[PDB]
Amino acid sequence: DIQMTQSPASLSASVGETVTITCRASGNIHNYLAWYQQKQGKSPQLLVYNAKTLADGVPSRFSGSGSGTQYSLKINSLQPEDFGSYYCQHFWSTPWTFGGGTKLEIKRADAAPTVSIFPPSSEQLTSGGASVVCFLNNFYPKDINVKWKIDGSERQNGVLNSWTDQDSKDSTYSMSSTLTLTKDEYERHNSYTCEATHKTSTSPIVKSFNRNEC
Amino acid sequence: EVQLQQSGAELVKPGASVKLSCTASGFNIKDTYMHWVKQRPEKGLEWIGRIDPASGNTKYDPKFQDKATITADTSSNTAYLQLSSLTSEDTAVYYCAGYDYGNFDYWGQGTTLTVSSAETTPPSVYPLAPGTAALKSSMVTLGCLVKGYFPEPVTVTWNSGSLSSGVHTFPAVLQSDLYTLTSSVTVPSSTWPSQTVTCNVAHPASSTKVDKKIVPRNCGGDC
Amino acid sequence: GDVEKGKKIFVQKCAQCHTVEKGGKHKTGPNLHGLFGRKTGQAPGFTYTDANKNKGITWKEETLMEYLENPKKYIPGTKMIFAGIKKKTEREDLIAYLKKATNE
Ligand SMILES: [Zn+2]
């Protein structure tokens, strides 16, 4: 079995730039390498086959090259419609494996997330549940880590994280982290904290509230 | 006109099996290889295997050999994928595609499979109101937490859609057989709470329509 | 199959009438570069019989396996004079060689 190692997993670029995606096979695949493009929410589409032959309907700004175990997909002067994901796949032997993919995203200036914390609503508390919510909005780049602390102790159980795709208007990313506990446990603790660590600073952005303090 | 029409979305219980179909037109499935590819939400493509309908010969990625079975009824121009002993790990989109070594390469629209023990359940919509401290900045962030529903989808808007800028509606996440989703909206502190802000959430599957007005909560005032 | 064993077979039983490299010249039979994925009778520059020309098949592991076992049975009227390769493993190895050689 031959495995494809595709890099980079994520690629930040701008319209008008030229970019290169690479795929390394764990064994020689003798030019039997295809490239597929997948636009957000759509089915994959063949872009290049046999390492260098552009597929039907594919614009000449795309090109592929390589041989043996090393291959590349080059996009010249990126267009707005090119942003999305790309995957290589070899056809040399079973199984015909896909590389891990490359997500081509829009480059913009770094920005720290705007963090907002919310204690459980009285409505949810009446129902017997207690969800603490933290929004980490409009940050760039996309990598981010959140940590919940209850009375200074890290809490993993009951966390539900979700991330938006790159924002259509400002090219930033956002994340929602909800910590759910029972009303009973919620009342057994005082401070609830969510900490955001983003590349914009080594200092985490910490938001918190005291259940009993008002 | 080549076309690959896949079966509709499926909701099955864990431990059960399911069979997805891929009907071709504009070409005969005997002319190429019919493949099945899995893709989990926001993850990569996983080649399950393929079948050569002309020779019945099937190939698989070892990781799927005990999970999937690819077949083809050349007498109906349809290929199939059968998945057994379903677990939450099988929840994904499954694509069929017809192609071999050349320019002939066509993919279906994909089929979404959800494996869950859940029953249709309406969401609970909770308001996310800011405390006093978070209210005295240029902008203020409000939100709505949509919890415990099944199945997808749930839609969210703010002020019947008039509040479109500054909103972040997060992808629903399935946890312990119930979905949770949230949405935030950021508006100028001069507009709330003086003027109203309400999240409109709808869950078709349960005939649910909730209009949750965000009002100042204990420990967060000005209006 | 075994590409190495396949090369020896080709060298011995096919080379008299076929070349596999890019730009390879046509001999009694057509150059085979680009074979995989190509329909029957499509090597540019070669004049095939109508039988080979209209077989309407794409060359790949399964088709070549059947063809190489008994060419005239697979393509009646073919002007390729070859009785066939009976042993399955020999066809596999030869086919593996063809896959490599005709695409590099
Ligand atoms: Zn505590």
Q: Residue B150: which CATH number?
A: 2.60.40.10
* Portions of chain A given CATH number 2.60.40.10: 1-108, 109-211
CATH number for C29: 1.10.760.10
Q: Which two tokens stand for residue A107?
A: 């480059």
Burial of B25 (0-12, 13-18, 19+ CB in 10 A): exposed
Give domain status of residue B221, yes or no: no
Q: How was this structure determined?
A: X-ray
Give domain status of residue B223, yes or no: no
Q: Report the CATH architecture of A1-108.
A: Sandwich (2.60)
Residues B70 and B154 reside in one and the same domain: no
Choosing from B100, B117, B134, the residue where a domain stops is B117
What is the A150 CA–ligand 1 centroid distance (Å)?
6
Residue C48 one-letter amino acid: Y
Residue C13 one-letter amino acid: K
Residue C38: enclosing H or E segment and its boundaries?
none
Residues B112 and B123 reside in one and the same domain: no
CB contact under 8 A, C62 and B32: no
In terms of residue numbers, what domain contains B168? 118-216
Overall domain count for chain B: 2
Q: Report the CATH architecture of A109-211.
A: Sandwich (2.60)
Choosing from B62, B95, B117, the residue where a domain stops is B117
Please name the residue of chain A whose CA is at the shortest distance from the CA of residue C101: A30
Buried-state track C10-49, b at ≥16 Cβ within 10 A, e below 16: beeebeeebbbeeebeeeebbbbbbbbbbebbebeeeebe
Residues B127 and B30 reside in one and the same domain: no
What is the B35 CA–ligand 1 centroid distance (Å)?
53
Residue among A142, A179, A185 at smallest CA distance from A161 = A179
Residues B79 and B131 reside in one and the same domain: no
Give every strand in the sheet of B3-6, ordered side by side.
Answer: B3-6, B18-25, B78-83, B68-73
Residues B148 and B71 reside in one and the same domain: no
Residues B4 and B111 reside in one and the same domain: yes
Tell which of C59, C92, C95, C100 to mutate to test the A interface (max A CBs under 10 Å).
Answer: C100
B188 vs B195: CA distance, rounded Å:
11
Choosing from B96, B117, B138, the residue where a domain stops is B117
A97 vs A116: CA distance, rounded Å:
42
User: Which segments within chain A are labelled E, that is strand?
Assistant: 4-7, 10-13, 19-25, 33-38, 45-49, 53-54, 62-67, 70-75, 84-90, 102-106, 114-118, 129-139, 144-150, 153-155, 159-163, 173-182, 191-198, 205-210
Give domain status of residue B127, yes or no: yes
Please name the residue of chain C whose CA is at the shortest distance from the CA of residue A68: C104
| Resolution, expressed in angstroms to one decimal | 1.8
Give domain status of residue B71, yes or no: yes
Instruction: List the single residue in A53, A87, A164 with the smallest CB-CB distance to B45.
Output: A87
Overall domain count for chain C: 1
Tell which of B39, B70, B126 to mutate to test the A interface (max A CBs under 10 Å).
Answer: B126
